[PDB]
Amino acid sequence: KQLICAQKFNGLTVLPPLLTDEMIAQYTSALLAGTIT
Amino acid sequence: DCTMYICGDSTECSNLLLQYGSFCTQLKRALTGIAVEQDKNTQEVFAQVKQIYKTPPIKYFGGFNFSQILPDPSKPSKRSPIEDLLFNKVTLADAGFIKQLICAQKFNGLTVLPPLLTDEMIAQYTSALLAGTITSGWTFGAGPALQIPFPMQMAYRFNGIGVTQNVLYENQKLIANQFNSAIG
Amino acid sequence: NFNGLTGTGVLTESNKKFLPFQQFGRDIADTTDAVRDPQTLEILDITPC
Amino acid sequence: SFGGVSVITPGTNTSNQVAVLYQDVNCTEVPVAIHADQLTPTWRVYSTGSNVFQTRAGCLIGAEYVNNSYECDIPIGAGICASYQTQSQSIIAYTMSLGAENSVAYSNNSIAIPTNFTISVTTEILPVSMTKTSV
Amino acid sequence: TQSYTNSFTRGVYYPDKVFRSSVLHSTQDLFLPFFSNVTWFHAIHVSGTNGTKRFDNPVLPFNDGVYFASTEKSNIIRGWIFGTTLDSKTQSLLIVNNATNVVIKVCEFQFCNDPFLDVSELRVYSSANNCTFEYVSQPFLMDLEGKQGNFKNLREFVFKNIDGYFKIYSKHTPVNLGRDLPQGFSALEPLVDLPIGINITRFQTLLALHRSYLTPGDSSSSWTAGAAAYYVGYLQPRTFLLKYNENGTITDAVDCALDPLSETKCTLKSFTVEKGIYQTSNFRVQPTESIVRFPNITNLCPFHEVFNATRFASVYAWNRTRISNCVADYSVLYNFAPFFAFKCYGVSPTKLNDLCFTNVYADSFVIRGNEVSQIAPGQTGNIADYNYKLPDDFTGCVIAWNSNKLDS
Amino acid sequence: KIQDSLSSTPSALGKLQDVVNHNAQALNTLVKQLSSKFGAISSVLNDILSRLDPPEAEVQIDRLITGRLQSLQTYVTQQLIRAAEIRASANLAATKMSECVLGQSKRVDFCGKGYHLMSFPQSAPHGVVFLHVTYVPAQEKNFTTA
Amino acid sequence: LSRLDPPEAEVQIDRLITGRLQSLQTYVTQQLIRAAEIRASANLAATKM
Amino acid sequence: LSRLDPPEAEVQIDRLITGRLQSLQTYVTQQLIRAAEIRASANLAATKMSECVLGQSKRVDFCGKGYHLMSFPQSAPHGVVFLHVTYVPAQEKNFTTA
């Protein structure tokens, strides 16, 4: 995104989590399938 | 209190502190979080029960004697003899009781906020869940407390660890005497 | 170095609506975000590198 | 006779009325005594003569005691929590209601056993990660 | 006439020149208390012709600036007056506007009334004696007419003299329809700045007495009602938390010293506070007076004897003198020596006359110029380690002056 | 009805809301810490260099840098504690996932209140929410036992 | 503040206040860790109950 | 202390000692958090010993993966290492049930 978050041109960066919230949902769905089948 | 602890009633020192940025509002927030976390700790540990139980007026548990752990009306704090033993053993320093010498000398913004659950309702929680665990067993940990007699609850606990009810119902007096001696 | 206010970054034509007197923009950082050119009297944007 | 000052208020969009709590001080001495350029908080417009209750955490200004006890909303200390109550809206400070008082029918032969159950779903919200950052 | 009114929420300006948007920045500066007492004033000169004399001009205090708000048709009010002690004993200010002009003077003006004869000059001062500063240029107020008197113009002026740079924070709000100080909120922006330097504690203003109207007469006082159409407010130093709009203006603001709810909104940077308890500040009982208990001594211990001597001993054998019970004034000694160097240590000589000492010791000698600075706690050399050393924890200070005229 | 409870409740995801807002507030305080004089003439480096000269500019910058470094230090110091508490909560969540979800739990009042049947986890922003399915004995009737 | 003059009393006060602030920060940093330990013990106590 | 003189060496030493003290304070602040983490892990290890080693655990996925049988601990440098023994159903076959 290069106003509050954009203002951080002060060496303060937030790193994206390794597991984006589309594979975490896959994990949850998979173990739901396990726990209900 | 940052201002009181650092610059005691000095306008110039307070002015010099103000420029330091929001380095004490954060300090206040940290300790406020600590205090509310303490209150939540006590509430979570003790207030596991939605409703307060009272022991039945009569006290017979098939030879089991809970006199040392159930609160007594004789003592003015409504506590168990054991609980009073612990209260005597532990030497509390401060409790925030509007004292108005070590605690007194803290005219430096260091105050001790009294806990939300005073030690007369914590005793009520403890007594309530004691009544629950000695009249209803575990059932009050799941739903409405289910009135179950204590020798039978005891035989059920024995069933829990693979000893079967017959051991308990053939040794009830022995288990009661051992339990009473241990509690004493 | 607009009117003695320094800083390093890219300047874009901003959509801010600085009032006739307000000169340097701000965000909630106590750091400048937009500036008005003292000569052209137009509202620039400040975005560091 | 200094001490902490705490403001007890409901949500701003519920009222603009608050009840001040002074930390660890009896009111009969200082917080009732007030004059212009005498106490550092100049918000002292509060009466200090009405709705003055005494609490072990220091006495409270702005709310009146109620014998009734409910699940407490704004914690105060020493088993006291004030909350907004419809009389017709004012702040009331009471003693904590520990919970619904209940009895059991323990006997040496009576038992209680359910005949119908109830499946209920609860929620436990556990954080597992916080916003990773680098400086 | 004079009457009182409630300030409501008004008298808020932008503390700075800088722009903000969707910020809740707070500041400490001079402001108007919200819901404060405001004094109306009116001057009746309509019957002045039929004798009876105006007789209606108080001496309004100025302490810590003044807020101004009123509604004049075109130029009914012209200017204001600052100063103190009135007479030529001290100075005074003569701020007044002219059509499209303004003239400022700090001359020592002696006067008795405030009648700026016009609808000219004079009648309001009689001494252009020792004027120090003057100023001109565009006037503060621009008149705008909505073709009718319904749009009653309101001229909100913030007046301050903090280290000069006298402030013209002002705005035009003709949205009034008759109600005095209508509910709402507007901000104020500056126009000009200029330093003078003067102790002002008196305020007065100038009206158009030569043609006045709508000045009813009554005995209204002590929190009563009366039409004056001229408001004055005083400022006190406060902390304010301001809501800067998305556009950049000020939409609304709250005080930090009026109500505990406002104090909460100020101590946590938000206009909205939810249910719960919060910590704001403490409360301290203020001192009633200050008590001094310095020992009851009057015999001034001899400092002239040690300072102004004729046989000052050598450095290798320094001349030590003990000071005993005495009240010593460390301000009469400045004429006892040229005082080439009067540097002092952790005790500063300035408020040295408000301290009490166990016992004071003075040692006098003579040294060379290149070693006048050699005497200090922990110095090393010839004298500094062989003839006289000061310990590192030494408190007090040294006095040096050249004696080349005498010791030659 | 659990979806309706979550939707119409004032705030049920208080823990995740606090987890996000705590980092947001810490970051904003850290950034706002840049504008403080820390006992220096000004808090802007270009000005404190151009107006001043290196002799005392060095010590002024030293004061500003030690203040700034201490302010940054407190941020990470509280960050380690927050992440340790989050590690404890995540270990608690992991055991809950390993048990309540992948089997029944004989631990009473661990996987929700009441006797436990199973659970269904659902992904959440910066956290996980469990849907414990629990057996509650509900209404009862007294009997006479021996 | 009764002995010095403001010019250097400012730096003396600043040195004292930064020392005091460091001392106070140490206390709260220790308190946070003690609270983490107490919270772990209290969660263990809640599970035990 | 061989170069300067006490007057200014006092402030120079003061700056050096406050820097060194800040550095040392950082070390023990990190040590406290590290030891808190190790204490939590050691409580986990103690519960793991008392549960897995001294009996079967009905807790799923606590003492290794699969149904738990027992555990043999092994001493490790500044740590403990468990040998969980687990029953995994391995190969299976479908069937018809009612």
Ligand SMILES: *[C@@H]1O[C@H](CO)[C@@H](O[C@@H]2O[C@H](CO)[C@@H](O)[C@H](O)[C@H]2NC(C)=O)[C@H](O)[C@H]1NC(C)=O
């Ligand atoms: C308004 O009144 C002032 C005095 O109250 C007058 O100032 C004169 O301004 C003109 C402008 O060129 C000068 O030539 C005169 O010398 C000024 N007179 C004095 C006595 O200073 C004038 O009547 C008005 N001011 C203006 C027009 O600037």
Ligand SMILES: *[C@@H]1O[C@H](CO)[C@@H](O[C@@H]2O[C@H](CO)[C@@H](O)[C@H](O)[C@H]2NC(C)=O)[C@H](O)[C@H]1NC(C)=O
């Ligand atoms: C104010 O102006 C008056 C004008 O007369 C000054 O009065 C005299 O000024 C001369 C200047 O050479 C002095 O020698 C006299 O002693 C003054 N007479 C007095 C003071 O009675 C007066 O000095 C001026 N004051 C200032 C402060 O400028």
Ligand SMILES: *[C@@H]1O[C@H](CO)[C@@H](O[C@@H]2O[C@H](CO)[C@@H](O)[C@H](O)[C@H]2NC(C)=O)[C@H](O)[C@H]1NC(C)=O
């Ligand atoms: C401005 O001048 C007036 C002149 O009266 C000062 O008022 C006097 O101040 C002294 C010093 O404190 C005191 O004797 C009284 O407060 C006043 N004297 C009389 C006779 O009333 C006023 O203090 C001056 N302002 C400032 C800021 O010094």
Ligand SMILES: *[C@@H]1O[C@H](CO)[C@@H](O[C@@H]2O[C@H](CO)[C@@H](O)[C@H](O)[C@H]2NC(C)=O)[C@H](O)[C@H]1NC(C)=O
């Ligand atoms: C030291 O004390 C003597 C008094 O013994 C004073 O001498 C005066 O010096 C001034 C200036 O030269 C003369 O105007 C006086 O007439 C002198 N008076 C006397 C009585 O001598 C003075 O206080 C000091 N003198 C020196 C030279 O420092």
Ligand SMILES: *[C@@H]1O[C@H](CO)[C@@H](O[C@@H]2O[C@H](CO)[C@@H](O)[C@H](O)[C@H]2NC(C)=O)[C@H](O)[C@H]1NC(C)=O
């Ligand atoms: C040291 O003290 C003073 C300072 O020069 C010298 O002078 C006498 O000091 C005594 C007090 O000790 C006074 O009572 C005398 O009045 C001072 N003057 C004379 C002429 O005696 C004193 O002589 C010095 N002592 C030394 C150098 O041993």
Ligand SMILES: *[C@@H]1O[C@H](CO)[C@@H](O)[C@H](O)[C@H]1NC(C)=O
């Ligand atoms: C203040 O009042 C409380 C409540 O009555 C009382 O317990 C306390 O002792 C009083 N303060 C002192 C110092 O006695």
Ligand SMILES: *[C@@H]1O[C@H](CO)[C@@H](O)[C@H](O)[C@H]1NC(C)=O
């Ligand atoms: C500034 O000056 C230039 C030329 O000197 C002129 O063209 C322009 O109109 C002036 N004003 C603005 C706002 O640029």
Ligand SMILES: *[C@@H]1O[C@H](CO)[C@@H](O)[C@H](O)[C@H]1NC(C)=O
């Ligand atoms: C506050 O409450 C009022 C009425 O109770 C409501 O209209 C308003 O939307 C609420 N505001 C917020 C921010 O919740």
Ligand SMILES: *[C@@H]1O[C@H](CO)[C@@H](O)[C@H](O)[C@H]1NC(C)=O
């Ligand atoms: C509370 O209880 C006592 C007596 O029962 C007394 O203070 C008062 O009458 C009661 N107050 C109310 C509101 O019932």
Ligand SMILES: *[C@@H]1O[C@H](CO)[C@@H](O)[C@H](O)[C@H]1NC(C)=O
């Ligand atoms: C229950 O205990 C009481 C008190 O000892 C006794 O009188 C009663 O007979 C007992 N009932 C049974 C069924 O044992």
Ligand SMILES: *[C@@H]1O[C@H](CO)[C@@H](O)[C@H](O)[C@H]1NC(C)=O
């Ligand atoms: C204003 O002053 C009058 C009389 O001086 C007084 O009666 C009234 O209470 C005051 N109001 C405020 C808000 O100060």
Ligand SMILES: *[C@@H]1O[C@H](CO)[C@@H](O)[C@H](O)[C@H]1NC(C)=O
């Ligand atoms: C605020 O800005 C917007 C867009 O720049 C504009 O439409 C609106 O009129 C402005 N509000 C004012 C000037 O009050």
